[PDB]
Amino acid sequence: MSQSNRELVVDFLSYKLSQKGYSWSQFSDVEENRTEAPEGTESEAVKQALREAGDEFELRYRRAFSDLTSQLHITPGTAYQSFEQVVNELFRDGVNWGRIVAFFSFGGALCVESVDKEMQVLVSRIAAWMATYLNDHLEPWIQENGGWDTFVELYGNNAAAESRKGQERLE
């Protein structure tokens, strides 16, 4: 996944900043590029699958993880080792089939607050550490069924991925 699941983080943090009607990817300007590594397949639908479902379950656990991120109050010079401690615990409670979109919820709540602190430089660092963990402990264990592509199977049959072409009529 490497860069694909990293840009998955970037747009997911944008969706979190949308609480304010904002995106840090506006500053990055890469919403014009429209890259996001979607492969033009269905791996694009991953972010929307994790958006609808992940944020639905989140709401209760969102205020709960706001109380977690209240401890992880992002001050000038907060060591990411505090977050790494929460991510450590996260792995021990499970390999994170659903707790992995909750991993995006912790770092997402952090990135809302760190932009709110004008530590958007720490946001890009949080997206880096998240992407690191993703390709480090999660990536094989999830990639067996996509991890996130399971959510995609249930919400879309990749029927839209077939029709994504559309261009067969041009001949």
């Binding site: 609808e52 479902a53 639905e56 379950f57 499970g94 659903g98 249930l154």
Partner: peptide, 16 residues
């Protein structure tokens, strides 16, 4: 069964 996609998913996924 419910079959409500997300609601059912997270209901069973919540207590791991």
């Amino acid at each position: 069964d419910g079959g409500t996609t997300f609601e059912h998913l997270w209901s069973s996924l919540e207590p791991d």
